[PDB]
Design a protein around this ligand. Structure first.
Ligand SMILES: O=C(NCCCOCn1ccc2cnccc21)c1cc(-c2ccc(F)cc2)cc(O)c1O
Ligand SMILES: [Cl-]
Ligand SMILES: [Cl-]
Ligand SMILES: [Mg+2]
Length: 213
């Protein structure tokens, strides 16, 4: 089996069904004690929680699900009826994420999409009946942060006040995205310094709030 399957089986055998906080704890314990993996992790997760609670978004788009850690983290804080759409290009990871969400009891809040962001973003309005997004969590290929931000805008998916929250802006890094949003009058940007998941390595989140054209 793969690392991702081992993480899912660990959660199934060490967390309580229907209890999202147990699922996050189990993932973080496994990835601290057994095998590192690219989940957002608890240090950066606690900053995500504070952002989610400040904005109480009704409709969130995540780019990059992986094993569903960030999807569990955000969906557990959504208000009743609020929704998360999460895009995952790797079908094995899409299947782990669906199973992780099932286990956590969050499957009615989340729709796990299996494809590439550049293919799926243009289908959001017609196929997933999206008007505009309240928040976007960027956690996919780091060289896609910037092009997908611009594609979201092209597609009319951003509105005044949509919150972009970007993982890994330091490690691995997203230098073009950072320079762009920080330089642009169309974004109001804040950096939250933290640590790479499970490591004593500096990383950070960027929040970039869209201000319209
Ligand atoms: O690579 C990372 N994430 C991206 C996964 C592929 O995403 C592909 N992907 C997922 C949906 C999706 C939709 N469209 C396109 C590609 C799409 C990633 C990497 C590291 C990391 C840090 C230090 C290291 F030494 C090694 C790795 C940390 C992270 O937190 C990450 O998130
Ligand atoms: Cl994650
Ligand atoms: Cl961590
Ligand atoms: Mg990440």
């Amino acid at each position: 089996d793969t690392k991702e399957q081992r993480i899912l089986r660990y959660v199934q055998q060490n967390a309580k069904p229907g209890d999202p906080q147990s699922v996050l704890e189990a993932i973080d314990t496994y990835c601290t004690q057994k095998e590192w993996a690219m989940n957002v992790g608890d240090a950066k997760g606690q900053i995500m929680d504070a952002v989610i609670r400040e904005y109480s978004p009704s409709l969130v788009l995540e780019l990059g699900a992986y094993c569903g850690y960030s999807a569990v983290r955000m969906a557990r804080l959504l208000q009743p009826g609020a929704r998360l759409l999460t895009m995952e290009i790797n079908p094995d990871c899409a299947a782990i994420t669906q199973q992780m969400l099932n286990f956590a009891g969050l499957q009615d809040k989340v729709t796990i999409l299996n494809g590439a962001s550049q293919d799926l973003i243009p289908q959001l309005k017609k196929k997933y009946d999206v008007d505009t997004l309240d928040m976007v969590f960027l956690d996919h290929w780091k060289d896609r942060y910037l092009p997908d931000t611009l594609l979201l805008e092209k597609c009319g998916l951003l509105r005044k006040g949509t919150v972009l929250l970007a993982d890994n802006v330091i490690v691995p890094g997203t230098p073009d995205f950072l320079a762009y949003v920080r330089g642009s009058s169309s974004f109001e940007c804040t950096h939250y310094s933290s640590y790479l998941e499970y490591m004593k390595v500096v990383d950070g989140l960027e929040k970039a709030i869209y201000q319209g054209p």
